[PDB]
């Protein structure tokens, strides 16, 4: 028996309890699991957004129904990230300004794969018509019916819970973590030790043999998972793995957040996350029932905590001296290696980017999934560790580049922050993709249908940011192809077939906007 016998997870929150619950299922009762988590001082719940695979890849794996967990964390529905004021100058405002060309400064990044005609995505037929003046429609409204549903604030399900569209979730992270702790302790026999870590004990090879807690108790184990957050108490301190700072790619390094009571009856509930451009970063808005989480992400090189706090307060008309605020300084980048010896980092201890595309929980689920597949024995085969590390670094570096593109192709030059973004270097892989896009070609064409894509985690993981996503961001920000895809000039029958697809998107939008309940009414039914 060369097998791991005990796994010790350092830290709770979403990373620790997701790791514990998932390995609890994956390891089929053959391994003892211990979580060491300090008792937490409650923070105001500032909200978290997600991607659509979360229910199939995580909660369904555990046998937890959607309704059951949503009801315990005041969850709500997300059909997109909506970008506001990313092309126009001025102070932070929740209200979209007007472009020079008359359009409102808003664009959406929704979920779902674009349809095709003649093996060409609908994106390309839209681009051809827009470049030739045959349409004035934006990409998002021409190509996704979700745009019209979100503009009317309708829900992504009917009141009988029939599905109408793709969606993800908004929720209180600290409640999801509590829900998962309860699940893991009562249904999977995870041991919860409520204490702080004071020592990390190592053998002659530098492998961890145990942690000591503040009370003096020693927790022995074979494999250690670092979910300790930005401090990286195992991976960075004890194992001495360097963190690669990537502030030469992304500038924001701080946030100030709160939760804002909201009149759902008067205003309705928006089925989407908003990203509101500010003078020295951007502000998230994550609606739940009765409230929204909000947070201004900023670079402390271009604004002081007080400046940021004032600009954030002015957005929502908060009184800055009579408001509860959380302040965070973050690490941007990743570890040189995520897994060293018998220490595997997951969550913030591993890697982090600002939540501009709701990547946080995804990075956790992906790391845990890959750990279960690369799960070691006590010989810790180096190839197994290497392959895991290689997946984590490519996943992170890919999303990092995608995020950088949101900033680099903003036309804003009104503040030193917006201008500073354009003096950073683009990474090679994203320069290559921009060039491809600019010639009218697709970037990262989806391999498969939407069922298979959101059904099989490996299919999404290998094609996470597809053609549709690059169009949403580049076209949204005003970067167009230099010309249409030249093949389209030879394909009049394919042009006409795409016209039918555009008409289908319009019909679906008009029909569903008439018949769907409001997001508010679906939430009221769900939360009982
Ligand atoms: K051991």
Curated annotation (Swiss-Prot):
Its EC number is 1.14.19.59. Keywords: FAD, Flavoprotein, Nucleotide-binding, Oxidoreductase. FAD binds at residues 12, 14-15, 38, 41, 44, 46, 49, 197, 348, 361. The record marks 357 as: Important for activity. Chloride binds at residues 359-360. The keyword Ligase does not apply. Gene3D superfamilies: FAD/NAD(P)-binding domain. Involved in the biosynthesis of thienodolin, a plant growth-regulating compound. Catalyzes the chlorination of tryptophan (Trp) at C6 position to yield 6-chloro-tryptophan. It is also able to use bromide ions to generate monobrominated Trp. In vitro, accepts a wide range of amides and peptides carrying either L- or D-Trp at the N-terminus. Binding of tryptophan induces structural changes. Binding of substrate to the halogenase reduces the affinity for the oxidized cofactor FAD presumably to facilitate the regeneration of FADH(2) by flavin reductases. Belongs to the flavin-dependent halogenase family. Bacterial tryptophan halogenase subfamily. Homodimer. Monomer in solution. This is Tryptophan 6-halogenase ThaL. It comes from Streptomyces albogriseolus.
